Amino acid sequence: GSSGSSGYVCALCLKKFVSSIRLRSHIREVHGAAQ
Numbered sequence: 001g002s003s004g005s006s007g008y009v010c011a012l013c014l015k016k017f018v019s020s021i022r023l024r025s026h027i028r029e030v031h032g033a034a035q
């Protein structure tokens with residue numbers, strides 16, 4: 001396997017973030033996966 005990508009990226013909007021949490025909540029406010 002190959003390595004590279006360090007940061008985290010959304011699975012829907014495909015947007016990169018600073019940390020995991022910052023991305024998690026983003027999906028709850030932007031994507032709101034708490035339906």
Ligand SMILES: [Zn+2]
Pocket residue numbers: 010011012013014015026027030031
């Ligand atoms: Zn997103």
